[PDB]
């Protein structure tokens, strides 16, 4: 609550708020160092694992309940990056950073 | 003398108005989507029955 | 609880350009975080692992 | 309206704040400066304009 300026953040530059400018704890680019789910808005972000970026949704998937072999045969790989099927909202993102 | 940023005018290709610049309409799809609305908004819903049925409802 | 197995640890480098209020100082700037994925904030020496 | 409250938020266009909300984001010593906007509205201690 102290990190943002709650009496002042009402207005937009981009779709990010004023609070994502007055303090780097509230924007969607400063990633917390131990993430469990990927965030919701990655407009000005591109995440890399190999030499190339991982922008399109062709290298993201999640199935628990079907117990498939090509995930569990490439657990220590660099391509697939089996994300959770639950994106993180603004509150869980900034509180993870906190 | 490096890569600085100044106030250029915002260039945007536009069109000044004329007398024969027409906005063409898709006939065979959008007029045929307007057809069913035109034939269904003739019969009924004249907005002359709601307050008159209310002032008849208070009577009866 | 072995219903929800995740993959191994893989360090995610994030190439995230800055916002559009500090962009004009070197507009070819990018940042580089090193956020880890599938891990834990370990604080002790795990004596069995 | 008791059912149309979720039908109001189904558009995604922001509502601008009014002048009374524009008058509370100032400290007590910055109200009397030219950077303030609403000095052409604060005309009476009994009435809002």
């Amino acid at each position: 609550r102290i990190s943002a300026l709650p009496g002042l953040n009402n207005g937009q530059l981009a779709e990010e708020p004023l609070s994502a400018y007055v303090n780097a704890l509230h924007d969607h680019r400063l990633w917390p160092p131990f993430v469990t789910h990927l965030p919701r808005n990655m407009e000005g972000v591109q995440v890399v694992a190999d030499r190339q970026p991982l922008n399109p949704a062709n290298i993201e998937a999640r199935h628990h309940g079907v117990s498939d072999v090509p995930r569990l045969g490439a657990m220590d790989a660099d391509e697939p990056l089996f994300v959770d099927d639950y994106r993180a909202t603004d509150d869980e993102w900034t509180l993870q950073k906190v | 003398s490096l890569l600085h940023t100044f106030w250029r005018l915002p260039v945007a290709v536009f069109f000044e108005p004329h007398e024969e610049n027409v906005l063409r309409c898709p006939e065979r799809v959008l007029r045929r989507l307007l057809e069913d609305a035109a034939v269904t908004m003739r019969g009924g819903g004249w907005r002359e029955d709601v307050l008159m049925d209310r002032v008849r409802k208070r009577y009866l | 609880a072995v219903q929800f197995v995740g993959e191994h640890v893989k360090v995610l480098e994030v190439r995230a350009p800055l916002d559009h209020a500090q962009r004009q100082g070197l507009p070819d700037f990018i940042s580089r975080q090193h956020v880890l994925y599938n891990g834990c904030c370990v604080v002790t020496a795990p004596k069995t692992l | 309206a008791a059912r149309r409250i979720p039908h109001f938020y189904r558009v995604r266009r922001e509502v601008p704040r009014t002048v009374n909300e524009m008058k509370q984001d100032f400290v007590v010593t910055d109200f009397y400066k030219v950077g303030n906007i609403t000095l052409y509205t604060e005309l009476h201690p009994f009435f809002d304009f």
């Binding site: 890399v48 694992a49 190999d50 790989a77 660099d78 | - | 100082g25 | 910055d30 950077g35």
Partner: peptide, 29 residues
């Protein structure tokens, strides 16, 4: 400080290009 708003947020304070001129891998593994 709010008098100096006509000074602090001009773009010439945030341009290090003449300052820069005068001053002078696979993550999978």
């Amino acid at each position: 400080f709010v008098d100096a708003l006509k000074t602090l947020c001009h773009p010439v304070l945030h341009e290090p290009a003449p300052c820069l001129q005068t001053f002078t891998e696979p993550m999978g593994g």
